[PDB]
A = this chain, B = another copy of it.
Amino acid sequence: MKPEELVRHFGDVEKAAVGVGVTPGAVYQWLQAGEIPPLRQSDIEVRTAYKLKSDFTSQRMGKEGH
């Protein structure tokens, strides 16, 4: 999932940081980097009860290219 997905899901950066167990500053650095670290994406997928999908899962669960 892209960092803006994570923000859309929770509503804002502060709520996303609390939801995923990181600092707000970390979430802004994901936004700036245009990507959430993989290990971290897995945790977001699990901690949203699979509502957000890691790029790993998305890529495989695309009948095509996602």
Per DSSP, chain A at the interface is helix
Q: Which one of B40, B54, B56 lies within 8 Å of A39 (CB-CB)?
A: B40
Q: Which one of B47, B56, B57 lies within 8 Å of A56 (CB-CB)?
A: B47
Bound CA span A1–B57, Å: 19
Q: How many copies does the complex hold?
A: 2
- Tell me the smallest distance from the CB of A6 to a CB of chain B, in Å: 14
Bound CA span A56–B56, Å: 20
Q: How many A residues, CB 8 Å from partner?
A: 15
Q: Let me know if A46 is at the binding interface, CB within 8 A.
A: yes
Chain A to chain B contacts (Cβ below 8 Å), 10 pairs: A38-B43, A39-B42, A39-B43, A42-B43, A42-B47, A43-B43, A46-B46, A46-B56, A46-B57, A50-B50
